[PDB]
Amino acid sequence: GDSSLYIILKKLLDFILKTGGGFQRVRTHLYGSLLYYLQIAQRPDEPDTLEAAKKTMWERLTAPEDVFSKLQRENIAIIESYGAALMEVVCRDACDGHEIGRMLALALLDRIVSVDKQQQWLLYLSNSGYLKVLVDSLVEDDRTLQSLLTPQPPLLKALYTYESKMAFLTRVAKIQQGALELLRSGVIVRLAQCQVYDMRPETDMFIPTPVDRYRQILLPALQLCQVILTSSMAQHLQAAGQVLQFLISHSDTIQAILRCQDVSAGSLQELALLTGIISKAALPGILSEL
Amino acid sequence: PGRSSLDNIEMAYARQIYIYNEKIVNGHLQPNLVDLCASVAELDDKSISDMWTMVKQMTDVLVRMEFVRQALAYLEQSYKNYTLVTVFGNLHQLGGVPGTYQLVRSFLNIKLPAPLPGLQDGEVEGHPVWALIYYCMRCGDLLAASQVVNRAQHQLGEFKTWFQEYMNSKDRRLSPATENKLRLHYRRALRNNTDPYKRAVYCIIGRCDVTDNQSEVADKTEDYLWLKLNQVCFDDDGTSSPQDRLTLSQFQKQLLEDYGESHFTVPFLYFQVLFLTAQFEAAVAFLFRMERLRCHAVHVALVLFELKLLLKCLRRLNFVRLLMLYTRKFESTDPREALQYFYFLRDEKDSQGENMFLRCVSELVIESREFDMILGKLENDGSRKPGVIDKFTSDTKPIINKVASVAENKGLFEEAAKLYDLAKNADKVLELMNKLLSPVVPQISAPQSNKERLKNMALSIAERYRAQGISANKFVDSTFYLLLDLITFFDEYHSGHIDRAFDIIERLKLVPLNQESVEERVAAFRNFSDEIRHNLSEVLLATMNILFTQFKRLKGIEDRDSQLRSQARTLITFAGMIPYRTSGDTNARLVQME
């Protein structure tokens, strides 16, 4: 049992909240340990495992096992307290310093993220901070993909972080309350500002690599939009209208995406699916275009 | 929206590759390009379409395969076709015979050289001779052009000589002699003056002035290309040390500079210029742009590919990867189609590509996890029913082991069992199988519909393998049957049939029905295989249940209550002896009493 590990997890949270450590270097270490701990606790299991455990509890027909759920609950309580405090510290920190330590802190934020999805965090986190900052950072994401060539190097830093940021955004969108916060932050606006979509990637390093990269950005952002759309009530709701505007305004890209090949094709294929999901999920983009 | 438009298109294209794969397999003579040309006719494709015709002319247009020669031929034939069509439609019907010369006279006379005739040509007997020679040349009818000059009535006659030998040879008229002399005359006399067509003929035939362009009579973009193609001199260019050499490479670069897609306007036409110019890579990349229709670029590449080009994904040209990336879009949804596309990779025959193909397929199987579709399915003896890949064939066993082991990591049991069946590791299958059925047996009750799952799976394999030349270990099979027997006991346990359950449980020969032989049941307990050792808990308590319910004290003659009573007793002694080696529910006691 990684019970012994639990104590270290507590110490880590303590130090972070305290934000002692002149070195972000120190905090990077704390973030790394926390990340492993969160990951370790839930060995890759998916909703099926949870459903099986619930049934067994079903009810305690005899002696049940509910060990992993119990462990997750304890982790989440500890984390909550310490949490509000530490969320503040973790996000601010974020930005700066450490573009480095960043790779570590964004990964920590994402793991944490699943668990403690649901709950808790959405409220806290919401507010603050994050949203505002993260949406603005979408705009700047577009700019950051170009700056991407330069910095291929400084890339190492940022791939660990930028990808982590997209993931964090996608995860928030997966749930109702999270999607609401992102959308409130003016997601569509930042995306319009990034101008990632309102262009043609082909227009324009070995060229297939750049296409893979650009399309890659498009697939994640597109997933974030689709997730935000569906995650609310995609119908009469306001969300449906916003997504439709997204499609029409960035039409012809959707159409253009539909045919061709490579790993680039693979990325293209995923992008195509993502648009399709956006289409049906909304009022059928086609349906709207009666 | 929904865009059934593309999906329909996707399917149409997929259909065509599919037929192409059938032909390759069946040694057929199905043309890819004619097939696109047929579909492409409809619209916007009127560009893409012309592109396809260009490729098709190339069909077996090797015929050797000279870059500029073929490009020239395409342009020349196109012009000829254009000429024939104009003639083929009213008039006179032209007065004379249909000879090629006359057709061109018609083009020159009827077509737009005259609104109502006139200006700056040299004309004899109503005919611009130089224009004629130029157009005949344009058509590719060099011989006729030469003849016209012969008959000409002209006085630059030295040129006449230089035309004939240009014609005689490979058309790279290279006399170690005069060419130099012709050039001087051009510069002095011809260059600063004359009738546009005359200049064209001199310049083009001579390769007189490498700074390039013909003033008055370049009327079309293709005219523009054709002229340039005529000018380049590939063979023995390196030999001879003047710098009046113009190469395909040089031509290609000019097309790039700025001339740009915009410059080649009809952007529509730019595509064609790229193919003609030999910029295949650029051509795919360019097709790669509008909506490039990743789909279109992919297929065109496929077509160049059939042609045996590609001689060394927005910007990623390699054929394997171009195909692979294309697959990414549809692979999850349409794994079959993905296979069809990956298969094309072999079209480039050679190792490397072959492995790339294999790796791609391997990669497809893994993570798509569409095992049945991709790998195969159910024996009913009769080996595998082939998966799509198997139809293509070969390395399939090694992929299976790889996938199966991976399944083991993930713990995706069922997939593993499925994979091992294909692997034909019969013993392995049953063993994994015994494990699956074994747990799920121990647990708590209320399950087991009579139609589908691990139990059902159990039934499938036993019926299936055991009769037929069974390769499995006897031990392995034995536990298998026991698990099945226990399961049938379950079916009948509840759903009534109390009496039947005892009979079957006793048959198991696991639990002491007889005397105090309960202890022998101890001795034989530790020996028990791990799978059964686990199951016993329910065997007991099932017994004390039926035993209880059946032996409900009856109302108001032979009633031997004593048995079905002794059975409980022996069972309890049994349970009493192994409670520690059991989960910890001697709540047999609750059922035991009342």
Curated annotation (Swiss-Prot), chain A:
> What does the tissue specificity note say?
Expressed in the testis.
Question: Where, subcellularly, is it found?
Answer: Nucleus membrane; Nucleus, Nuclear pore complex
Oligomeric state and interaction partners are given as: Part of the nuclear pore complex (NPC). Forms a complex with NUP35, NUP93, NUP155 and lamin B. Does not interact with TPR. Interacts with TMEM209 and MYC.
**Known disease link:** Nephrotic syndrome 13: A form of nephrotic syndrome, a renal disease clinically characterized by severe proteinuria, resulting in complications such as hypoalbuminemia, hyperlipidemia and edema. Kidney biopsies show non-specific histologic changes such as focal segmental glomerulosclerosis and diffuse mesangial proliferation. Some affected individuals have an inherited steroid-resistant form and progress to end-stage renal failure.
**What does it do?**
Plays a role in the nuclear pore complex (NPC) assembly and/or maintenance. May anchor NUP62 and other nucleoporins, but not NUP153 and TPR, to the NPC. In association with TMEM209, may be involved in nuclear transport of various nuclear proteins in addition to MYC.
Q: Which family does it belong to?
A: Belongs to the NUP186/NUP192/NUP205 family.
- Annotated protein name in UniProt: Nuclear pore complex protein Nup205
Top-level taxonomy: Eukaryota, Metazoa, Chordata, Craniata, Vertebrata
- Give the encoding gene's name: NUP205
UniProtKB/Swiss-Prot annotation, chain B:
Tell me which UniProt keywords the record has, alphabetically. Answer: Disease variant, Membrane, mRNA transport, Nuclear pore complex, Nucleus, Phosphoprotein, Protein transport, Translocation, Transport
Q: Does the keyword Signal apply?
A: no
Could you tell me the superkingdom of the organism this chain comes from? Eukaryota
TM spans (from-to): none
How does this chain sit within the bilayer?
Peripheral membrane protein
Q: Which residues carry this modification: Phosphoserine?
A: 241
Which terms in the Gene Ontology molecular function aspect does this entry carry? structural constituent of nuclear pore
Outcome, altering residue 382 to V: In NPHS12; doesnt affect nuclear envelope localization; doesn't affect nuclear pore complex assembly; doesn't abrogate interaction with NUP205; abrogates SMAD4 interaction; abrogates IPO7 interaction; impairs SMAD4 protein import into nucleus; impairs SMAD4 protein signal transduction
**Keyword set includes Nucleus:** yes
**GO cellular-component terms in the record?**
centrosome; cytosol; membrane; nuclear envelope; nuclear membrane; nuclear periphery; nuclear pore
Q: Where in the cell is it found?
A: Nucleus membrane; Nucleus, Nuclear pore complex; Nucleus envelope
* A single GO BP: nuclear envelope organization
What is annotated about its quaternary structure and interactions?
Part of the nuclear pore complex (NPC). Component of the p62 complex, a complex composed of NUP62 and NUP54. Forms a complex with NUP35, NUP155, NUP205 and lamin B; the interaction with NUP35 is direct. Does not interact with TPR. Interacts with SMAD4 and IPO7; translocates SMAD4 to the nucleus through the NPC upon BMP7 stimulation resulting in activation of SMAD4 signaling. (Microbial infection) Interacts with SARS-CoV translation inhibitor nsp1; this interaction may disrupt nuclear pore function.
Reported disease: Nephrotic syndrome 12: A form of nephrotic syndrome, a renal disease clinically characterized by severe proteinuria, resulting in complications such as hypoalbuminemia, hyperlipidemia and edema. Kidney biopsies show non-specific histologic changes such as focal segmental glomerulosclerosis and diffuse mesangial proliferation. Some affected individuals have an inherited steroid-resistant form and progress to end-stage renal failure. NPHS12 inheritance is autosomal recessive.
Q: Which family does it belong to?
A: Belongs to the nucleoporin interacting component (NIC) family.
Q: What does this protein do?
A: Plays a role in the nuclear pore complex (NPC) assembly and/or maintenance. May anchor nucleoporins, but not NUP153 and TPR, to the NPC. During renal development, regulates podocyte migration and proliferation through SMAD4 signaling.
Q: What is this protein called?
A: Nuclear pore complex protein Nup93
Q: Which species is this UniProt entry from?
A: Homo sapiens (Human)
Q: Which residues of the full protein are shown?
A: 173 to 815 of 819
